[PDB]
Design a protein around this ligand. Sequence first.
Ligand code: X0A
Length: 294
Amino acid sequence: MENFQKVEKIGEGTYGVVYKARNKLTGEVVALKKIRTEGVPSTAIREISLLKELNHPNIVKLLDVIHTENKLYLVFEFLHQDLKKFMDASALTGIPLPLIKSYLFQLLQGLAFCHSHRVLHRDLKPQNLLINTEGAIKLADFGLARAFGVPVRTYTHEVVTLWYRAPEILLGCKYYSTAVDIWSLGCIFAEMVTRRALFPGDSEIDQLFRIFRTLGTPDEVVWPGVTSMPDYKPSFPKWARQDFSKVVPPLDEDGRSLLSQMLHYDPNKRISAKAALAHPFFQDVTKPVPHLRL
Ligand SMILES: Nc1nc(Nc2ccccc2)nc(-c2cc(Cl)ccc2O)n1
């Protein structure tokens, strides 16, 4: 748009490309996300518009929702680096535990906030998490999947990230709950710790089986109703659960304990963001300053 003297394309999200842009007028630097056709649903514009009211220190502010030329643009406050990039840049030394802990605590605060407002993210991933020089981390792009509905293959054909998808989604559950975000966050937490994606599935079944190989194939004991899930197949191989200390070494028992609660198979047993905030793991949480190279 002419209102912006655009800076550049900075990434591609599940629902569209994100641009860094300068509001010529105000000179404001923002993140502009172009939503991907029919002509842009009306129910969606209303629902996404409601997200403009979301105000929380750990939620990237949605400044505007612009509908034009049969195209939807979301204008977001701009943060300089996404967690994926930070993790790649910190892959040699790892993110200090205090920072990982700070980030997780803040992320849980953001989710607790959104969930308490009946807003789910549904597609949480490192690239959706933005950090700034002052130690804050924020979640961006909530409520998009619930407003537009999950795609399948971007217009530009880009490898959709399945790594953070909760098993109930993989098993074809038509109804999502706040639990899917906790699962995604658990996966991200594990990744910050180990510096490697926890469940880097190549496909939907590989994603599911990687989960099964690590957490054990779920059954009716650990997850009542799982054998009735839409995509559940009795033919699924039955893997025994792996010793959990093997999953995120060298994370201490508090962290491993919290993580195990975030990764419970049953969305109903999975810890809530609010409950997670009270976990002993955060007893000594602080807010460290990240070494950010912008
Ligand atoms: N620094 C920075 N990088 C990126 N990269 C990125 C974008 C899309 C996919 C993957 C990475 N995205 C943002 C960003 C994104 C949104 Cl939604 C809202 C505000 C933002 O500041 N910011």
